[PDB]
Amino acid sequence: MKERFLERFSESAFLLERLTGIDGKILLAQSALETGWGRHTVGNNLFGIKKLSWLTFQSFVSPENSMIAYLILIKECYNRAWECRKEPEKYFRLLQRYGYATDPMYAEKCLDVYNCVE
């Protein structure tokens, strides 16, 4: 359920916004998209992070850990996107351009979900 998902992870997202500067709604949008509002999460991996993502799926002790791992991944491997972490449209477009996802409409979908969160 969308509301349950947001009620479970909004605090995490906005704490990480305060800590790192990323738009917390970006975190919620991408994880909602990957997991289907939390319905399909495997191994507490909210973002579909793979074991060789440092360019199968990683498992985590907690879903929050996967959130933190995601931030490390973007900061270290998608730094151009990391610089635009307060600009959702630009951010998602950069992730797609830098091959974060193979889905040719990934950024479009992220943005639609972002608008839903918002």
Phi-psi category of residue 37: left, alpha or beta, with phi > 0 → left and psi -120 to 50 → alpha: left
Instruction: Please report the resolution in angstroms.
Output: 1.7
What CATH number has the domain bearing residue 57?
A: 1.10.530.10
Token digits of residue 94: 């950069």
Q: What angle do CA 45, 42, 47 make, to 5 degrees?
A: 30
Q: Which residues pair with 50 in a beta bridge?
A: 57
Find how far residue 45's CA is from the centre of its chain. 10
The domain in which residue 106 lies consists of 1-118
Q: How many domains does the chain have?
A: 1
Q: After which residues is the chain broken (C to N over 2.5 A)?
A: 55
Q: What angle do CA 91, 97, 83 make, to 5 degrees?
A: 35
State the method. Answer: X-ray
Cα separation, 10 vs 118, whole angstroms: 11
Can you spell out the DSSP letters for 7-71?
HHHHHHHHHHHHHH---HHHHHHHHHHHHTTTTS--TT-SS--BTT----B---SSHHHHHHHHH
